[PDB]
Amino acid sequence: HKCDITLQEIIKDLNSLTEQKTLCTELTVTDIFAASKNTTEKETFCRAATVLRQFYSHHEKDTRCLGATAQQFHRHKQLIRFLKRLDRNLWGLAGLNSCPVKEANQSTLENFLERLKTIMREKYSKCSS
């Protein structure tokens, strides 16, 4: 389970998500990476999945995000679709709903997703030769 291809599915969507630099991607999420980091792999997954579910739930219809042009709206819909898919994959790896997130610091979503991408690529690296 630890080195499952879900890791690739997550990294793919993080690569898609981090091309985006929009008003929406500068809105914030609770920075799970501001912890002095006392957490199992499964608990980190649960934490990331929680904050991202909060984000897409709160911003799927946010007028700062929805866009004026066709391209902006398309990019918003893509952002939300990729966040939901990333989130489904993170939950599947968490095996866990019960991970209280208590950090104060807020990160932009862009910075949070880049950090998560680094973490996931590191896990991938530790799985492979």
Residue numbers in the entry: 1 to 129
What does the paper say about this structure?
Analysis of the variants T13D and F82D yielded dissociation constants KD of 0.02 – 0.04 nM and 0.03 – 0.04 nM respectively. The increase in affinity is mainly attributable to the reduced dissociation rates (koff) of T13D and F82D. The structures of the IL-4 variants T13D (max. resolution 1.65 Å), F82D (max. resolution 1.7Å) and T13D-F82D (max. resolution 1.8Å) were refined on the basis of the structure of wild-type IL-4 (max. resolution 1.8Å); all crystals were obtained under identical conditions, allowing detailed comparison. In the variant T13D, the aspartate residue resides in the middle of the first α-helix αA, and the side chain is oriented towards α-helix C. Both carboxylate oxygens of Asp13 are involved in a bi-dentate salt bridge to Arg85 on helix αc, thereby tightly fixing the side chain of Arg85. The geometries and distances of the bi-dentate hydrogen bonds are close to ideal parameters; the planes formed by the carboxylate of Asp13 and the guanidinium group of Arg85 are out of planarity by just 14°; the lengths of the two hydrogen bonds are 2.7 and 2.8Å. The χ1 torsion angle of Arg85 is in the trans conformation (174° IL-4, 176° IL-4 T13D) for both proteins; in the case of IL-4, χ2 of Arg85 is slightly off trans (160°), whereas for T13D, the torsion angle χ2 of Arg85 is in the trans conformation (176°). In contrast, the χ3 torsion angle differs by 115° between IL-4 (58°, gauche- conformation) and T13D (-57°, gauche+ conformation). Modelling of the interaction of T13D bound to IL-4Rα suggests that the guanidinium group of Arg85 (T13D) now forms bi-dentate hydrogen bonds with the main chain carbonyl of the receptor Asp125. In contrast to the hydrogen-bonding network of Arg85 in wild-type IL-4, Arg85 in the complex of T13D:IL-4Rα is probably also fixed to Asp13 (T13D) via a bi-dentate salt bridge. This internal hydrogen bonding would result in fixation of the Arg85 side chain prior to complex formation.
Interleukin 4 (IL-4) is a pleiotropic cytokine that plays a major regulatory role in the immune system. Signal transduction of IL-4 is mediated by a sequential binding process, initiated first by binding of IL-4 to its high-affinity single membrane spanning receptor chain IL-4Rα. This intermediate ligand receptor complex then recruits one of two possible low-affinity receptor subunits, the common gamma chain (γc) or the IL-13Rα1 chain, into the functional hetero-trimeric complex to initiate signalling. The overall structure of IL-4 comprises the known four-helical bundle in up-up-down-down topology, which like the crystal packing is unaffected by these mutations.
